[PDB]
Amino acid sequence: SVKVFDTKEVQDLLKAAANLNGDAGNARFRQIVHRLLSDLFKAIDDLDITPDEVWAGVNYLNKLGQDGEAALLAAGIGLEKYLDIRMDAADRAAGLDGGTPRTIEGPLYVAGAPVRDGVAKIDLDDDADAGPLVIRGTVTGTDGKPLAGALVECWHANSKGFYSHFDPTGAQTAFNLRGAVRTDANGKYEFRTLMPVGYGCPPQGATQQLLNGLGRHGNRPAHVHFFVSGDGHRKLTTQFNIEGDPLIWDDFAYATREELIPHVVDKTGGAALGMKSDAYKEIEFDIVLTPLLDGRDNQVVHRPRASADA
Amino acid sequence: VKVFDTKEVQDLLKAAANLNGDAGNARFRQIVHRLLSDLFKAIDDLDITPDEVWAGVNYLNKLGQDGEAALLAAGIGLEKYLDIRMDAADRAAGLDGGTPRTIEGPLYVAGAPVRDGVAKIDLDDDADAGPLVIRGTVTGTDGKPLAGALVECWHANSKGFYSHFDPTGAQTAFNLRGAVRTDANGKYEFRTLMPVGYGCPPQGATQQLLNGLGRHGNRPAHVHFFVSGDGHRKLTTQFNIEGDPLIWDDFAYATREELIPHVVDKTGGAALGMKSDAYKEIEFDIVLTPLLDGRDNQVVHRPRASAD
Numbered sequence: 001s002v003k004v005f006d007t008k009e010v011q012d013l014l015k016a017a018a019n020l021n022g023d024a025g026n027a028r029f030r031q032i033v034h035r036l037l038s039d040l041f042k043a044i045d046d047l048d049i050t051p052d053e054v055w056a057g058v059n060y061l062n063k064l065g066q067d068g069e070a071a072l073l074a075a076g077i078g079l080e081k082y083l084d085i086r087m088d089a090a091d092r093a094a095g096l097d098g099g100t101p102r103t104i105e106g107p108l109y110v111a112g113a114p115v116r117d118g119v120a121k122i123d124l125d126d127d128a129d130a131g132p133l134v135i136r137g138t139v140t141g142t143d144g145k146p147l148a149g150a151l152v153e154c155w156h157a158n159s160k161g162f163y164s165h166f167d168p169t170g171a172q173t174a175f176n177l178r179g180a181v182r183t184d185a186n187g188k189y190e191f192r193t194l195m196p197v198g199y200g201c202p203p204q205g206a207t208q209q210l211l212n213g214l215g216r217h218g219n220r221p222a223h224v225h226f227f228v229s230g231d232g233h234r235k236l237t238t239q240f241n242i243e244g245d246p247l248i249w250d251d252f253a254y255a256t257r258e259e260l261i262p263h264v265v266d267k268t269g270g271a272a273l274g275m276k277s278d279a280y281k282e283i284e285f286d287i288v289l290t291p292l293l294d295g296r297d298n299q300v301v302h303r304p305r306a307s308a309d310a
Numbered sequence: 311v312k313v314f315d316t317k318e319v320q321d322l323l324k325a326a327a328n329l330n331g332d333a334g335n336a337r338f339r340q341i342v343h344r345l346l347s348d349l350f351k352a353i354d355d356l357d358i359t360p361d362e363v364w365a366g367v368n369y370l371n372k373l374g375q376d377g378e379a380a381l382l383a384a385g386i387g388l389e390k391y392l393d394i395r396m397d398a399a400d401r402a403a404g405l406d407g408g409t410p411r412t413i414e415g416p417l418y419v420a421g422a423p424v425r426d427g428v429a430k431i432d433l434d435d436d437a438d439a440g441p442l443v444i445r446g447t448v449t450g451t452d453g454k455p456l457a458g459a460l461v462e463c464w465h466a467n468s469k470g471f472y473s474h475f476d477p478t479g480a481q482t483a484f485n486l487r488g489a490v491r492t493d494a495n496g497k498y499e500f501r502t503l504m505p506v507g508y509g510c511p512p513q514g515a516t517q518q519l520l521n522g523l524g525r526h527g528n529r530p531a532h533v534h535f536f537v538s539g540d541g542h543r544k545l546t547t548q549f550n551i552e553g554d555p556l557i558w559d560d561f562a563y564a565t566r567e568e569l570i571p572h573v574v575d576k577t578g579g580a581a582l583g584m585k586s587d588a589y590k591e592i593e594f595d596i597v598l599t600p601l602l603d604g605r606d607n608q609v610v611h612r613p614r615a616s617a618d
């Protein structure tokens with residue numbers, strides 16, 4: 001095995017490829033590209049990665065983007081969780097760690113859902129195998145005062161593990177199991193929905209192909225996603241997990257947190273609330289938001305996100 | 311903040327790569343763990359933000375949707391780097407005298423018809439490209455001509471486009487692509503038209519990254535070759551058209567000084583079946599390296615297009 005990485009020829013090639021000695025441009029982008037390319041070249045040298053192996057990796061990247069699954073792989077190999085770990089460490093150093101814990105967004109948010117005052121019913125399609133579920137709570141600041149007019153958004157899967165706008169078996173109604181609620185004067189929000197089921201990666205897709213290569217499964221336990229925002233506060237990205245799911249501590253995207261597994265309560269009286277059975281489940285999920293530091297939210301994330309019209 | 315060295319992060323990497331899993335593909339897990347660890351460390355060291363990361367994730371979607379991962383591999387020098395490591399291995403083994411290798415590029419098409427000695431490979435009219443004869447002798451490093459060696463070439467038209475990859479309309483199958491078996495004296499000949507340099511698809515992922523770096527995505531005019539023969543390794547090489555202003559500024563870093571032959575002006579082209587009496591001739595002799603104990607330690611298997 002040869003070792004060439006630390007030769008002038010290779011180091012000059014990397015400088016040229018990243019255009020380090022180029023005219024005034026995007027120095028930050030060039031710095032990132034040079035670092036990533038240098039690390040890749042060094043890894044090839046150290047592990048003696050063969051051309052056949054490299055071209056197989058190149059081919060996988062083609063499949064990954066052809067499948068549109070780069071963000072699913074980002075969750076599956078722990079990169080999305082890692083970003084949360086770094087955000088959590090920064091919050092702890094700054095004293096901005098007093099709110100409800102964050103966890104990963106995942107790749108399935110859809111913008112444009114209808115907004116209701118106080119209460120929203122979000123199961124637009126019938127799903128005989130999912131039972132009714134009420135999610136409710138109060139949004140407060142870290143000082144405990146209720147936040148009125150805060151925006152609570154949630155999205156989750158049906159009983160087959162599919163989300164509206166991403167269902168391969170057939171179109172769901174737009175924004176099925178997706179809603180937004182403006183909290184009332186006392187900070188309260190409530191969703192009436194159906195119970196989600198966990199799901200697995202598309203089995204022929206690039207993410208499952210790599211997981212199979214590693215010997216890992218690509219399943220998530222049942223969960224519900226939230227964004228919560230409000231004037232004067234940071235935007236929270238979080239979720240909760242459904243108690244009792246066998247995969248709850250074996251999520252392929254490493255997203256479960258012990259503080260985000262709320263007690264599920266058995267209730268009756270569902271028909272009066274517009275649910276399809278007398279018996280239903282209720283999950284209380286309170287939210288504590290952190291005030292902005294210096295008037296700016298330095299952890300809100302901009303990424304490509306789907307959108308639709310109601 | 312710096313979190314890379316923490317137990318939480320190192321445990322996450324071990325789980326993500328399944329290092330502690332049942333017996334499996336140990337080599338694949340090793341590579342994945344190394345690449346993931348390096349990525350995580352780079353994010354920590356350079357304080358790469360979530361917004362930046364998700365832009366990079368979005369780029370990977372576009373790269374694969376465009377089918378351009380191998381074009382990017384050329385443009386950021388990874389393909390040249392693979393050649394650098396192969397060259398270092400050959401030097402350490404004491405090999406010299408062979409025609410230098412250079413990059414394959416991503417545009418080979420398998421299945422071209424094989425002709426004896428001479429092949430006319432310009433099937434489509436191209437008014438702006440003049441006639442070109444490429445000819446030469448294939449030998450081994452002992453200087454002896456190799457008879458029945460397989461010489462393959464492919465190159466672009468006057469618009470910079472290759473058959474099977476032309477966005478402006480399908481070319482005839484195997485236009486400007488051919489394969490010849492050398493004659494008893496090692497000789498091969500292609501009758502073709504003069505290539506012009508290739509450029510990246512302007513709206514594609516490779517050119518988008520290059521624009522962000524402030525780089526061009528252009529290649530000087532060149533002709534690709536595969537050359538193979540009994541008792542010898544398979545050679546991947548090319549030559550460049552002398553005098554091209556980009557000859558030492560290839561965005562894929564492929565030029566080598568021994569692969570720039572002289573171009574000669576000739577007459578008599580009609581008798582050779584060329585479209586005009588005046589034509590250009592390039593004599594490109596090729597020297598193959600022998601096998602080692604029957605083995606070829608540098609032939610590359612990668613996905614390649616095909617046609618009939």
Ligand SMILES: [Ca+2]
Pocket residue numbers: 039348
């Ligand atoms: Ca390193």
Ligand SMILES: [Ca+2]
Pocket residue numbers: 123124125126
């Ligand atoms: Ca209904």
Ligand SMILES: [Ca+2]
Pocket residue numbers: 215332
């Ligand atoms: Ca197993």
Ligand SMILES: [Ca+2]
Pocket residue numbers: 121274
């Ligand atoms: Ca109703």
Ligand SMILES: [Ca+2]
Pocket residue numbers: 405406407
């Ligand atoms: Ca010698």
Ligand SMILES: [Ca+2]
Pocket residue numbers: 432433434435
């Ligand atoms: Ca013709």
Ligand SMILES: [Ca+2]
Pocket residue numbers: 478479480481
């Ligand atoms: Ca045409």
Ligand SMILES: [Cl-]
Pocket residue numbers: 105106107108
């Ligand atoms: Cl998700």
Ligand SMILES: [Cl-]
Pocket residue numbers: 414415416417508
């Ligand atoms: Cl090429």
Ligand SMILES: [Zn+2]
Pocket residue numbers: 106108156223225
């Ligand atoms: Zn989800």
Ligand SMILES: [Zn+2]
Pocket residue numbers: 415417465508532534
């Ligand atoms: Zn080419």
